[PDB]
Design a protein around this ligand. Structure first.
Ligand SMILES: [Ca+2]
Ligand SMILES: [Ca+2]
Lengths: 152, 152
DNA sequence: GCAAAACGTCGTGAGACAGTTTCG
DNA sequence: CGAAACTGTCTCACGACGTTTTGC
């Protein structure tokens, strides 16, 4: 449980509400008990020419990594234990993304107990349904409705 | 001289490096001693549905206004005296737009002294030439080189 | 003459995903 | 079977300007 500075979290909080993104997805995968994977990721996008800023995040936050995708670069943090630790300390300073942040935290908490019941998985599959609305979604496909392919 | 909260500044700073934009322009206007106006402006843009955040900024920052422009809305601060006071307080916490913040501040200071010498005005038109380089410009027209219409 | 407000839009820099592969 | 990586992309939501008008 690595603890972060308050001035660090305050700034970042504003930058996250700015260019950050708190994604939560249900990815269809046959290798999973319920045919879908619950992906949770914290993104931070920026012009590759400004990648150094992204790289600096991997150092300051501790975990995570930075991917390159042409003209733009993202800083990705998908590791659940660390991510839950980050959003726990960050959540109190967010103003725009503070709802999804706490939703993602909620999902992480119920992830183990959602691997058991098909009814719970579907309910957690609903939390993410909420995050997507709160975000500015436009290219979403796999929703909790489709996850009801459980009826077999 | 209104003093802003340190935590308000810490958060806003990240958000400014996020969705904000510190601009400086040279607008061709015949009504001016040198045919050009030195326009300075602090912008903050968000989806019109998230405008409420911009209206909140008008309260917290004390000055400024919010304009509508379709799907998007901007919070604009163009007043010199209050702007200078705001950036002077914000500058230390910025991380991506600190250079331009200060350049703008440099400009404001030498604004009344550039209204006099066509040489001073051409030098300041240069500070702004620097801010644009620092920003992600791609629609710029009137630069200091063009300001050299002073050759009459 | 000039500070500041109006008003319009080019071209992305981003948000928010998707789909597939790897690893243990 | 799952956590987490790797790879790809639609559609903006933004940045950063430009032109014109106030009115004192
Ligand atoms: Ca944004
Ligand atoms: Ca940005």
């Amino acid at each position: 449980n690595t603890k972060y500075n308050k001035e660090f979290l305050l700034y970042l909080a504003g930058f996250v509400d700015g260019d950050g993104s708190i994604i939560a997805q249900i990815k269809p995968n046959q290798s999973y008990k319920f045919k879908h994977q619950l992906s949770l990721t914290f993104q931070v996008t920026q012009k590759t020419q400004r990648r150094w800023f992204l790289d600096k995040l991997v150092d300051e936050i501790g975990v995570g990594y930075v991917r390159d995708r042409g003209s733009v670069s993202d800083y990705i943090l998908s590791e659940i234990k660390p991510l839950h630790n980050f959003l726990t300390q960050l959540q109190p300073f967010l103003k725009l993304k503070q709802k999804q942040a706490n939703l993602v935290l909620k999902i992480i908490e119920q992830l183990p107990s959602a691997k058991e019941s098909p009814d719970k998985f579907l309910e957690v599959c609903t939390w993410v349904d909420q995050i997507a609305a709160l975000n500015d979604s436009k290219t979403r496909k796999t929703t909790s409705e489709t996850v009801r392919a459980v009826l077999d």
